[PDB]
Amino acid sequence: RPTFYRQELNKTIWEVPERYQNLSPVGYGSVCAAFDTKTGLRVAVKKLSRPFQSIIHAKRTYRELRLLKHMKHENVIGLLDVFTPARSLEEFNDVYLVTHLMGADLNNIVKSQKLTDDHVQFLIYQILRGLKYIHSADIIHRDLKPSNLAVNEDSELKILDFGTRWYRAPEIMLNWMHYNQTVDIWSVGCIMAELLTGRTLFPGTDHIDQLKLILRLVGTPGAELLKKISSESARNYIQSLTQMPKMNFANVFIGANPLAVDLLEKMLVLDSDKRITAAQALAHAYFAQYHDPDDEPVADPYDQSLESRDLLIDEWKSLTYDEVISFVPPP
């Protein structure tokens, strides 16, 4: 058991192992940057906010900890450490997560500029590779967007969720009851488009403006898609629309690598059943210089029905405690 030191930070007492040096606030929690003497890395230490105040908080704390503990991939956030000052379950009240210090997101690095095609291959390749891994764990991100992408000055990228609707799949904005993993692929298309052009693909002013802009690019639903609409009102409203043909992408993204355009076409199909998967996209000719089928790993999946239970606060609390005590730090 490590030696802890106390320090007032972010309006509370932080209590941390001495490996974590010179805490410096930066930000479900509050965050300090710190220097980890054990590893020599700059890190984010996140003191979780009111983790066991309510059933909802406790449940969310457990889901967060468990998810993070299982994410072990270069292009996805990982847990460097999780600790509590508590010595017993009975004194267990706080949870601190430790990750790499993530000081820049995709926006901080790209800055609204057009990127070179090679540069977009590398960034998009890395998103899809993380996403293959996430999707193999039977997880849907659901809110993938530049701000949820940590990127260092070497353009090395990690998907995370820090916890704008411009990158959201159309079905997510229409509160569709059930989603497939290709909601995230939509988001990737939106991001990819923007990296190539320097402009937000669908900058809607509100909900309806967002869909309008979408349908302008990808067309109104065709007959195949209309047949899959369960809602009689949604069905009958789509039949009220004046048909739009889907724009030819080749002429929306002029001068772009023809392969970038083709991948965009396979990503940004209105029918989510027809969108390319992450694994399929990694094998696309566009990533030829990056693709290695023997280094695009998948996750072992785990039991996410345990997260969706209806339990007592003290039940969630004790389950989160076991997850803290069982943590084994990475290589």
Ligand X SMILES: CNC(=O)c1cc(Oc2ccc(NC(=O)Nc3ccc(Cl)c(C(F)(F)F)c3)cc2)ccn1
Ligand Y SMILES: CCCCCCCCO[C@@H]1O[C@H](CO)[C@@H](O)[C@H](O)[C@H]1O
Binding residues vs ligand X (CB under 6 A): 26-27, 31, 33, 44, 46, 64, 67, 71, 76-77, 97, 99, 101-103, 134, 139, 141, 159-162
- Which CB sits closer to ligand X, 141 or 266? 141
31 is in an annotated binding site: yes
Alpha helices in 174-306 (DSSP H): 182-197, 207-218, 223-226, 232-238, 258-267, 278-282
Please tell me which residue in 36, 81, 94, 161 is annotated as part of the active site: 161
Task: Report whether 56 contacts 100 (CB < 8 A).
Answer: no
Question: Which residue in 76, 73, 79 sits closest to 100, CA to CA?
Answer: 79
Residue 138 beta carbon to ligand Y: minimum distance, rounded to whole angstroms: 15
Q: Using CB atoms within 10 A of its CB, is residue 132 exposed (0-12), middle (13-18) or buried (19+)? A: buried
180 counts as binding ligand Y under rule CB under 6 A: yes
Q: Which is nearer to ligand Y, 223 or 328 (CB)?
A: 223
For residues 77 to 116, the per-residue mask of contacts with ligand Y, x marking binding by CB under 6 A and - elsewhere, is: ----------------------------------------
Count, in order, helices (H) and strands (E) of the chain: 11, 9
Query: Residues 6 or more apart from 100 whose CB is under 8 A from it?
Result: 41, 42, 43, 44, 77, 78, 80, 150, 158
* 67 contact, one of ligand X, ligand Y, none, CB 5-8 Å limit per kind: ligand X
47 annotated as a binding-site residue? no
Shortest distance, CB of residue 28 to ligand X, whole angstroms?
Answer: 8
304 SS3 class: coil
238 binds ligand Y (CB under 6 A): yes
Task: Name the segment binding ligand Y (CB under 6 A); options: 89-97, 271-279, 291-299, 322-330.
Answer: 271-279
184 binds ligand Y (CB under 6 A): no
Interaction partner, residue 221 (ligand X, ligand Y, none; CB < 5-8 Å by kind):
ligand Y
Which helix or strand (DSSP H or E) is residue 12 part of?
strand 12-17
How, if at all, do strands 29-36 and 149-151 pair? unpaired
Using the rule CB under 6 A, is 170 a contact of ligand Y?
Answer: yes
Residues 192 to 231 in contact with ligand Y, rule: CB under 6 A: 211, 221, 225, 228
Among 179, 290, 302, 327, binds ligand Y (CB under 6 A): 179
Decide whether 37 or 231 has the Cβ nearer to ligand X: 37
User: Which entry of ligand X, ligand Y, none binds 16, CB below 5 to 8 A by partner kind?
Assistant: none
Sign of CA pseudo-dihedral 158, 163, 24, 86: negative
Kindly identify the residues of this chain, within the stretch 311-330, that bind ligand Y according to CB under 6 A.
Answer: none
Instruction: Record the tokens describing residue 25, joined without a space.
Output: 């606030």
Long-range contacts of 321-326 (CB under 8 A, 24+ apart): 321/84, 321/86, 321/89, 321/92, 323/62, 323/65, 323/66, 323/69, 323/82, 324/65, 324/82, 324/83, 324/84, 324/92, 324/95
DSSP state of 88: S
Distance CA 200, CA 167 (A): 9
Active site annotation includes 143? no
Candidates 2-10, 44-52, 106-114, 270-278; binding stretch for ligand Y (CB under 6 A): 270-278
Instruction: Confirm or reject binding of residue 181 to ligand Y (CB under 6 A).
Output: no
Stretch in the footprint of ligand Y (CB under 6 A) among 4-12, 48-56, 265-273, 302-310: 265-273
Annotated binding site: 26-31, 46
Binding site for ligand Y (CB under 6 A): 170-171, 174, 176, 178-180, 211, 221, 225, 228, 238, 270-273
Active site residues: 161
